[PDB]
Design a binder for this molecule. Structure first.
Ligand SMILES: O=c1ccn([C@@H]2O[C@H](COP(=O)(O)OP(=O)(O)OP(=O)(O)O)[C@@H](O)[C@H]2O)c(=O)[nH]1
Ligand SMILES: [Mg+2]
Ligand SMILES: [Mg+2]
Ligand SMILES: [Zn+2]
Ligand SMILES: [Zn+2]
Lengths: 114, 49, 196, 43, 83, 65, 138, 263, 559, 159, 133, 168
RNA sequence: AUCGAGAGGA
């Protein structure tokens, strides 16, 4: 009766973005980026791949409320080097390792019987 | 599975809950603080079968 | 509730992913706080969950029979020859992070009861509406979409905060605010009010 | 259904008690909590 | 009968009950478009506006505190120390 | 109340294994432990969705209408 | 055949009863984890088996002897608000309100007394997977 | 190869057990959590009951049908109902089914999924064949009929993911374990007398070394080497199950970079 | 008594309550469909019309919608109904009865209302799902578990009435107790067991989690503090990152019985300026105790400060516990082998030393003490004699619980449970009693048919030598029940006595209010007290202060 | 018994003293006794302690007794309250019961007295004895449905 | 912003008291009779046996929130292994002169006694601890 | 020694000795006239009641009295210049701030205590039975000795339960 | 809807 519809987990609504951008009001060269319609499959893999980059001062996320599936990401970087670029450049590192798994899996799968 | 016992009345089932009571025809001895006139009472409830 | 006076309602539902899982990938149906455990004493709930496991592995229906020769150290010798650890525990991974949970969890099968009383059958709200004729007070219970009683004991807590206009309100503009005509001498409701 | 059919109501020194002669005739724990507790007992 | 301008031995402090009420009586006035005095710094809650109107003691209304025997003691929100 | 499709905990198909259950339990005679195992049920989450099940439809079927 | 008498509370007064109809009768090394039992040699008649001090709702409880008794009572007042299958017949029975579990299951631990309470045939809950743990704090 | 090193040891039609070398954990856990939910499947989603004379109430049966296994390999070349342009459902978005069995026999008339009928044009692609694993060939008991009971049906099966209802999960059960011997010491053991005689030795100990007695704790060593076994319901054979994980993962790992290029 | 001092009222809701760790203390988890229904008469000002015409359009469905619009002449305009519901021109000075927005004042109570603290104003966060949702640390003054306790909500209609809630009844204002002069709300359960787990000197966290925790506290100044450790691997201490919630300007000194300014056993509690030196935070500090942090931070600016604090502590302990975990097994009630041997002989002597004092009155002489007379008598003598056979074993089974034992944790923290809770669970449940005396003789001169008449020994009047782990024996069992039963007795009945006791106390004292001259009076003008509490001083603002002019030497005084 | 006593040297050292415990009350004649301290003597009977020692002794006895009930095994109420209670009982002259008999007579407003235990018969005599009602109490204006002189109700607001 | 103390010490007792990680260490000073030391050392991270001698340099440098490394390589260690940052609090006394400090590395405490006094021991917030070999 | 007393000096003491953190081992700057003719003047203007007539001014003192005895005992010159070593500026603060903490700890005229004088009182008793239980034994006290002893108290109990006499 | 009965939840 008050249960919210099941699809409100990936179906983005009207006048809603899949990324939001505001800087942190306190620490400079730092941004809080608001992902929408997403859980810590994207909240987790993104932070722990923001850590390999030494050019990145800060990296964290929080599931704000189990009720609305949306996490916020806080990032702080080295003077002059954009945070938006920090993310952009970190995402492709994932992709690359992922498109690595596709190949490596099938190469080994094909060699198995049954 | 219905093992029954209920009386079917007006189209709903009714059940009889065992009523309780102090047994009859037994002589019992009662006190009964004294202030108060009396101090001791022998009592028997009495009814036929 | 379970079979042991273990009443407590759902507090959330986490999909199989956000759910803590096991070394084999067993998802729990059911998560209670280990805080409604000692309070509270109910050591049986524990043992039920310890026996019911073995039974689900060995195939054999377990004997949870009351005054009998069955021991925690008798189940433990069996759950130990079944590839789990003797007192029910299991190593678990946090679903949000796939990081091991630093403390082992107590995990297994406990027969659970669904009692009546579901929010959607209790949930009630009224803001104005149908009232009686005797008192012009809101009618009783959700069945005739009525209010709630602001009883004596309630009245007490209010004076306690000294909320003074709040006790004009919750006893005038939310119950009765009838309006009559008093006589300046013979202070009684008899005056004929020919209006407007 | 079972446990309603074998119910025992008592009208009105120490009545709500579980007493020694209750042993294995009335149920030691089967009783309606609050209201009229200890009065009504099941067999 | 009325106690004069002097001889004032109440608490010279705004009782929380005077507070809630004076805030309340004004929070009515604000909510029903009646003149607003302080520079409304882009706030629109008739509750929070009075909260500023009490910071800058600009509220016209005088609490008349009564004493058991009857005869009373005045004091205005401008005279009273908010705390 | 009719063996469930799959099992709430894991999710593995269980519906197809009730049929072979009775047959393994009764036709050539074995104990339950071996039953769930040859049926392929190794996880007890899923072992329980059969052992604990009672097929009430059976006695619903005994009715004329 | 003179093997079992009927005893009410009045006659019960002048009798001796053994528990545990074996315990408690034979002639006179031991497991430490097992429970602690006390011990007259002038018995009149034996108790059949302890559990039969319980009623219906109680005899539904696994190990009520390991359970703080006030709770055993709570469990009983709640056993009657359980959800299951009251009769096979319902799907033509016209009675105000009725609840039926989508997919019931027998329990896994079972008090012997269930067999006569036909419980393993008309259950009231599900043998779900239980995780006693702190997590979200919900 | 380049990064992640995947070594398979045991695999079949329904069970793929493998290692997964040289990855940080945040991938491993994101992987399964896409393998669970975010992979799409087809399964019943609009049932229209024409006639039911079974003891089983109407939406109860309807429910069970959702859960029933459905072939979904060519599922990618099927649009979503939301993302399709027709009205309710079409043949480029929804595979429609039908179910008919009638009590003609005195002695128990079983319904199965084998008794499901493909009604819509299949476009000739491989999609919407109810899965049979049954030794005999009768995939899963749907229902039971008696002497004179009918069940007349019309199913619409749609695309969907395990976030929207656990029927759409080509999931099953995901086995997960890193670090059998606690060398990383992410977890501290509950013991009574000893740990090694009170906790079991894990299947995953052959091909992972014993840490030795007098070797001081390794502080900075990280999460490498995870031991997984992925089970299939059957809608997607095991190989594709895992691939599509990676895929959908990347697919939405991309869908942000793209929407970032939108700002 | 039922229709003038206990009226039926409009604008009210009722539901099951559930826990939310991510709500804030002064908040209330109103379910959507209630807030679809509960109105608040608001007049239209040039301030609000922008939000308000936009509301009418949203209708009695879209959450921030509204029903009814009241006009000038007094005509009522239904909004689900009517044919002009899709527009309407808003004039100045019209009522626009509206749903409830987020952050509105509402009185949220629970029966039995046995306080003032049972009735508190709250902030409104309209939530999906149908449960009333609340802060885990606003549990204690209401008295409310989520086993399905049903709670209640009321909504003001004047703006003055509003103020009256948020300015008096507002949850934060009621944090410190004007009844027990100590803060009634505190960190409770998961947050309370884990805070302990966090602050263990032993407990470390690092980067990957550290950083996330900083992002958790909302008031974070974007300043990572410097990790107490920068050796081979940079760690933070559990204590460390906790300080981030501890606001800058707060100070705490404790000293327990074993506390050296070293705290070898990490005892006591030293906090400096919102940073933690040493100790382990538990119910004495983070708990609703007297000298506890919550008391401190509420008297040192301010209430709401303290209020936000609460919510922060949780959020971080919650996030830590989440990933570290905790449960409780049967193993946690298991006692070491050669120690439940040392308990059975601890009964075995305490029993055999009742057998001494039993053969005495059987002797008979006796030396039967002066009063202590008797019969009172030897029937008091055995009562302690086993109440000591229990409470010795209860301690013998505390030393066994090594620091991993999941139960002790919840006692070391005091989350829930204690000594007697441990004792009954591992040693023996003890001598049960009825009306203060060990089980009374029902049958003539005997307790049961399984005993012989006349047996004043323990296994015979209601003593249970076994634990709950071992399972009681029938004999024992039955008695325990009889006992238990007496508890569920006063639950419905003896409660009445006390509840009635109040209904008088309340009705008697009542209009005794401190008048405008600090002289406590009734309705007549009769003084009752000349300066309230004989010092004209509010309880809420008082603390356990130590007059160190009394104690000490005449010479320790001089120097 | 044990008793903290000022030692001539300065510190408080424990002075263990024989004290006597008695089932019985006859204060009147017991304190007159040769040998016992008639400054420290104390029966739990606060009813007789009142008739013997005047009203002010009673005041402190009734308190001490409520205390010994509430604040025994840990429990704590801040003086003010117990005190306040104690006081209300004490001032009318003797000991006034916290029941219908006592304070429900004490010349107070009628309607307020109507809202307790005896009900009708209270209004009956109110109608009989021609009683005038103050209208100053809590319950008076609750029944009449008004902002009663309570907390936010003490003062009226002007300009 | 200069190195502050340093002294050679020797372990007299290692007491694993209700803790697996982080021990307590009792140490007597080398050369300087008038001096004793008690400190909490993370034994898991840095093994300490009985009768092992150490190296204990203090210093106060080698708002600004905490960066990670970025190596650079902003100096300080390599030849100092065990490091901890903390805060000073109450200062002691027992002869006159001497005199003793209390340190708090986020819970892991320290007690050092001995009369050099110092005066290049400030009352201040800063406080490191560097331990090599 | 330990008693309910308003305004925590003990803390305003640690609030002084870390705000302006002196700290040592470096000597103060308040003359004996600053400390002493300070406390004894604060003692004038703490105020519980106000007036101007004799009776009020004496019932005033006879209410502060206790507080002062503590104030006097912790703001004493030896202490103020040995254990705590305050400065002119910091003491003038401890001076202003106690006064400030004090006239906040006033009972507000308005306060309805009669009610609050229950239920407090009627609460624990109610909830310290009604609890009710937990669990088994003994369990009172409390409660059984007890709450029916309480009943006695409020009734004017002529037929006393247990009449016990205690002689010294 | 009114009066009356019972059962159950905290
Ligand atoms: O007859 C009753 C019984 C109980 N109550 C109220 O409900 C509560 C009953 O107890 P709770 O259910 O609140 O907690 P508990 O731990 O005492 O019991 P369980 O959760 O195990 O069931 C009591 O604390 C009291 O506030 C009543 O108002 N009346
Ligand atoms: Mg509860
Ligand atoms: Mg409850
Ligand atoms: Zn399963
Ligand atoms: Zn379509």
């Amino acid at each position: 009766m008050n249960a919210p519809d099941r699809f409100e987990l990936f179906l983005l609504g009207e006048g809603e973005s899949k990324l939001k951008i505001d800087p942190d009001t306190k620490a400079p060269n730092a941004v809080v980026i608001t992902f929408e319609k997403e859980d810590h499959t994207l909240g987790n893999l993104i932070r722990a791949e923001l850590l390999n980059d030494r050019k990145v001062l800060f990296a964290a996320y929080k599931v704000e409320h189990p009720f609305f599936a949306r996490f916020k990401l806080r990032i702080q970087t080295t003077e002059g080097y954009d945070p938006k670029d920090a993310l952009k450049n970190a995402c492709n590192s994932i992709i690359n390792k992922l498109g690595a798994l596709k190949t490596n899996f099938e190469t080994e799968w094909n060699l198995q019987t049954l | 599975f219905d093992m029954g016992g209920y009386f079917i009345i007006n189209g709903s089932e009714k059940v009889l809950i065992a009523q309780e009571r102090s047994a009859g025809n037994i002589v019992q001895v009662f006190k009964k603080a004294a202030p108060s006139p009396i101090s001791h009472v022998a009592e028997i409830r009495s009814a036929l079968e | 509730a379970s079979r042991h006076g273990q009443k407590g309602t759902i507090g959330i539902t986490y999909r199989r992913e956000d759910m803590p899982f096991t070394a084999e990938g067993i998802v729990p149906d059911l998560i209670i706080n280990p805080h409604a455990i000692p309070s509270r004493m109910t050591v049986a709930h524990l043992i039920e969950c310890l026996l019911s496991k073995v039974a689900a592995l060995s195939g054999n229906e377990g004997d949870a029979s009351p005054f009998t020769d069955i021991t925690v150290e008798g189940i433990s010798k069996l759950l130990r020859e079944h590839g789990y650890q003797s007192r029910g525990f299991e190593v678990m991974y946090n679903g949000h992070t796939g990081k091991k949970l630093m403390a082992q969890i107590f995990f297994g099968p406990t027969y659970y009861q669904r009692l009546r009383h579901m929010v959607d059958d209790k949930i009630h709200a009224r803001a104005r509406g149908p009232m009686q004729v005797l008192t012009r007070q809101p009618v009783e219970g959700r069945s005739r979409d009525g209010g709630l009683r602001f009883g004596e004991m309630e009245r007490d807590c209010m004076i306690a905060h000294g909320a003074a206009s709040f006790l004009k309100e919750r006893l005038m503009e939310a119950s009765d605010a009838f309006r009559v005509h008093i006589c300046g001498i013979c202070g009684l409701m008899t005056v004929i009010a020919k209006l407007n | 259904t079972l446990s309603h059919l074998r119910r025992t109501n008592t009208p009105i020194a120490k009545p709500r008690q579980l007493h020694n002669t209750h042993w294995g005739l009335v149920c030691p724990a089967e009783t309606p909590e609050g209201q009229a507790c200890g009065l009504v007992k099941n067999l | 009968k009325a106690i004069p301008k002097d001889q004032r031995a109440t608490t010279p402090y705004m009782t929380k009950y005077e507070r809630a009420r004076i805030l309340g009586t004004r929070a009515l006035q604000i909510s029903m478009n009646a003149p607003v005095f302080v520079d409304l710094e882009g706030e629109t809650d008739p509750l929070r506006i009075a909260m500023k109107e009490l910071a800058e003691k600009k509220i016209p209304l005088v609490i008349r505190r009564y004493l058991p025997d009857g005869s009373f003691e005045d004091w205005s929100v401008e005279e009273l120390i908010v705390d | 109340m009719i063996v469930p499709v799959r099992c709430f905990s894991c999710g593995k198909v269980v519906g197809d294994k009730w049929e072979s259950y009775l047959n393994l339990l009764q036709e050539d005679e074995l104990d339950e432990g071996t039953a769930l195992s040859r049926l392929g049920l190794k996880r007890y989450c899923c072992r329980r969705m059969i052992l604990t099940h009672v097929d009430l439809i059976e006695k619903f079927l005994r009715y004329n209408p | 055949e003179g093997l079992v008498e009927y005893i009410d509370a009045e006659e019960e007064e002048s009798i001796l009863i053994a528990m545990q109809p074996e315990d408690l009768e034979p002639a006179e090394d031991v497991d430490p984890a097992k429970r602690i039992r006390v011990s007259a040699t002038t018995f009149t008649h034996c108790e059949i088996h302890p559990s039969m001090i319980l009623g219906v709702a109680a005899s539904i409880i696994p190990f009520p002897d390991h359970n703080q008794s006030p709770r055993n009572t709570y469990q009983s007042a709640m056993g009657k608000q359980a959800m299951g299958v009251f009769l096979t017949n319902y799907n033509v029975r016209m009675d105000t309100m009725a609840n039926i579990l989508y997919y019931p299951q027998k329990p896994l631990g079972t008090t012997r007394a269930m067999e006569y309470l036909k419980f393993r045939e008309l259950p009231a809950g599900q043998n779900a997977i239980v995780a006693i743990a702190c997590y979200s704090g919900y | 190869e380049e990064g992640p090193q995947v070594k398979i040891r045991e695999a079949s039609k329904d069970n793929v057990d493998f290692i997964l070398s040289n990855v940080d954990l945040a991938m491993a856990n994101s992987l399964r959590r896409v393998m669970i939910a975010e992979i799409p499947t087809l399964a019943i989603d609009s049932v229209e009951v024409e006639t039911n004379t079974t003891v089983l109430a109407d939406e109860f049966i309807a429910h069970r049908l959702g859960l029933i296994p459905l072939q979904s390999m060519d599922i990618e070349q099927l649009e979503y109902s939301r993302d399709c342009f027709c009205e309710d459902h079409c043949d480029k978005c929804s595979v429609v089914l039908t179910l008919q069995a009638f009590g003609e026999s005195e002695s128990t008339t079983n319904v199965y999924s084998k008794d499901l009928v493909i009604v819509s044009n299949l476009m000739g692609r491989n999609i919407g064949h109810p899965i049979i694993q049954d030794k005999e060939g009768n995939g899963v008991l749907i229902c039971k009929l008696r002497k004179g009971q009918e069940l007349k049906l019309t199913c619409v099966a749609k695309k969907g993911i395990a976030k929207e209802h656990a029927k759409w999960g080509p999931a099953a059960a995901i086995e997960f374990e890193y670090d059998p011997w606690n060398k990383l010491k992410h977890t501290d053991y509950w013991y009574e007398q000893d740990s090694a005689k009170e906790w079991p030795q894990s299947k995953n100990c052959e091909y992972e070394d014993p840490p030795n007695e007098g070797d001081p704790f390794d502080y900075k060593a990280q999460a490498d080497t995870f031991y997984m076994n992925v089970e299939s319901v059957g809608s997607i054979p095991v190989d594709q199950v895992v691939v599509r994980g990676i895929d959908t993962l990347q697919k939405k790992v991309a869908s942000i970079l793209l929407a970032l290029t939108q700002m | 008594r039922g229709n003038l001092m206990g009226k039926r009222v409009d604008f009210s809701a009722r539901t099951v309550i559930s826990g939310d760790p991510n709500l804030e203390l002064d908040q209330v988890g109103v379910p959507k469909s209630i807030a679809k229904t509960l109105t608040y008469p608001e007049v239209v000002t040039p301030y609000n019309i922008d939000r308000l015409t936009q509301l009418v359009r949203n209708g009695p469905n879209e959450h921030p919608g509204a029903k009814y619009v009241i006009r000038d002449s007094g005509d009522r305009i239904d909004l689900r109904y009517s044919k002009r519901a899709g527009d309407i021109q808003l004039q100045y000075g019209w009522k626009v009865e509206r749903h409830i927005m987020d952050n509105d004042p509402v009185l949220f109570n629970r029966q039995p209302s046995l306080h003032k603290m049972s009735m508190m104003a709250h902030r409104v966060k309209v939530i999906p799902y149908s449960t009333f949702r609340l802060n885990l640390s606003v549990t204690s003054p209401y008295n409310a578990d989520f086993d399905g306790d049903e709670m209640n909500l009321h909504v003001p209609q004047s703006e003055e009435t509003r103020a009256e809630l948020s300015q008096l009844c507002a949850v934060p204002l009621q944090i410190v107790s004007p009844q027990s002069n100590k803060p009634c709300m505190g960190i409770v359960q998961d947050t309370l067991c884990g805070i302990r787990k966090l602050t263990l000197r032993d407990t470390f966290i690092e980067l990957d989690q550290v950083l996330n925790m900083l992002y958790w506290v909302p008031d974070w100044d974007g300043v990572i503090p410097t990790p107490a450790i920068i050796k081979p691997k940079p760690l933070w201490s559990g204590k460390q990152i906790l300080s981030v919630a501890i606001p800058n300007g707060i100070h705490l000194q404790r000293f327990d019985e074993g506390t050296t300014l070293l705290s070898p056993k990490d005892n006591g509690m030293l906090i400096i300026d919102g940073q933690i030196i040493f100790g382990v935070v538990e119910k004495k500090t983070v708990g609703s105790s007297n000298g506890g942090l919550i008391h401190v931070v509420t008297r040192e600016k301010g209430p709401q400060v303290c209020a936000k604090l609460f919510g922060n502590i949780q959020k971080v302990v919650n996030f830590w516990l989440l990933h570290n975990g905790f449960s409780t097994g049967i193993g946690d009630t298991i006692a070491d082998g050669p120690t439940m041997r040392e308990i059975t002989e601890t009964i075995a002597e305490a029993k055999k030393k009742v057998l001494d004092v039993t053969k005495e009155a059987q002797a008979n002489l006796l030396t039967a003490k002066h009063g202590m007379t008797l019969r009172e008598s030897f029937e008091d003598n055995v009562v302690r004699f086993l109440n000591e056979a229990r409470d010795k074993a209860g301690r013998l089974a505390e030393v066994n619980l090594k620091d991993l034992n999941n139960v002790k944790q919840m006692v070391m923290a005091g989350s829930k449970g204690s000594f007697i809770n441990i004792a009954q669970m591992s040693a023996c449940v003890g001598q049960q009693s009825v009306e203060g005396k060990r089980i009374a003789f029902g049958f003539v001169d005997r307790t049961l048919p399984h005993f012989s008449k006349d047996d004043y020994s323990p296994e015979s009047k209601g003593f249970v030598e076994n634990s709950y782990l071992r399972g009681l024996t029938p004999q024992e069992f039955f008695f325990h029940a009889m006992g238990g039963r007496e508890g569920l007795i006063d639950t419905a009945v003896k409660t009445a006595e006390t509840g009635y006791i109040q209904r008088r106390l309340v009705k008697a004292l009542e209009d005794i209010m401190v008048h405008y001259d600090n002289t406590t009076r009734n309705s007549l003008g009769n003084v009752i007290q000349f300066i309230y509490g004989e010092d004209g001083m509010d309880a809420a603002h008082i603390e356990k202060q130590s007059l160190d002019t009394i104690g000490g030497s005449d010479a320790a005084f001089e120097k | 018994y044990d008793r903290k006593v000022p030692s001539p040297t300065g510190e408080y050292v424990k002075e263990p003293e024989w004290v006597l415990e008695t089932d019985g009350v006859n204060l009147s004649e017991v304190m007159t006794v040769p040998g016992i301290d008639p400054t420290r003597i104390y029966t739990n009977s606060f009813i007789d302690i009142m008739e013997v020692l005047g009203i002010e002794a009673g005041r402190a006895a009734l308190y001490k007794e409520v205390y010994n009930v509430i604040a025994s095994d840990g429990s704590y109420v801040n003086y003010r309250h117990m005190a306040l209670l104690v006081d209300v009982m004490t001032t009318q002259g003797g000991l006034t019961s916290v029941t219908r008999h006592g304070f429900n007579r004490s010349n107070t407003g009628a309607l307020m007295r109507c809202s307790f235990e005896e009900t009708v018969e209270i209004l009956f005599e109110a109608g009989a004895s021609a009683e005038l009602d103050d209208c100053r109490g809590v319950s008076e204006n609750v029944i009449l449905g008004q902002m009663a002189p309570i907390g936010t109700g003490a003062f009226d607001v002007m300009i | 912003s200069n190195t502050l103390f340093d002294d050679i010490f020797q372990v007299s007792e290692v007491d694993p008291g209700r803790y697996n990680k982080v021990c307590r260490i009792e140490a007597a000073s080398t050369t300087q009779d008038q001096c004793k030391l008690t400190l909490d050392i993370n034994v898991e991270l840095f093994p300490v046996a009985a009768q092992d001698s150490l190296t204990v340099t203090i210093a106060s440098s080698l708002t600004r929130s905490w960066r990670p490394p970025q190596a650079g390589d902003r100096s300080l260690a390599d030849d100092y292994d065990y490091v901890m940052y903390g805060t000073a609090y109450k200062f002691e006394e027992v002869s006159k002169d001497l005199i003793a400090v209390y340190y708090s590395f986020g819970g892991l405490l320290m007690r050092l006694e001995g009369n050099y006094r110092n005066l290049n021991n400030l009352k201040q917030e800063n406080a490191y601890l560097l331990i090599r070999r | 020694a330990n008693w309910p007393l308003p305004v925590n000096i003990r803390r305003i003491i640690q609030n002084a000795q870390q705000t302006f953190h002196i700290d040592h081992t470096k000597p103060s700057d308040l003359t004996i006239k600053d400390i002493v003719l300070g406390v004894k003047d604060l003692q004038e203007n703490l105020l519980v009641l106000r007036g101007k007539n004799e009776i009020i001014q004496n019932a005033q003192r006879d209410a502060v009295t206790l507080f002062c005895c503590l104030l006097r005992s912790r703001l004493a010159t030896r202490r103020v210049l040995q254990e705590y070593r305050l400065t002119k500026q910091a003491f003038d603060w401890v001076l202003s701030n106690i006064e400030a903490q004090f006239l906040r700890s006033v009972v507000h005229p308005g306060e309805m205590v009669g009610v609050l004088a229950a239920q407090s009182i009627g609460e624990p008793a109610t909830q310290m039975t009604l609890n009710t239980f937990h669990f088994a034994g003994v369990a009172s006290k409390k409660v059984t000795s007890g709450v029916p002893r309480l009943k006695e108290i409020l009734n004017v109990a002529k037929n006393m339960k247990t009449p016990s006499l205690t002689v010294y």
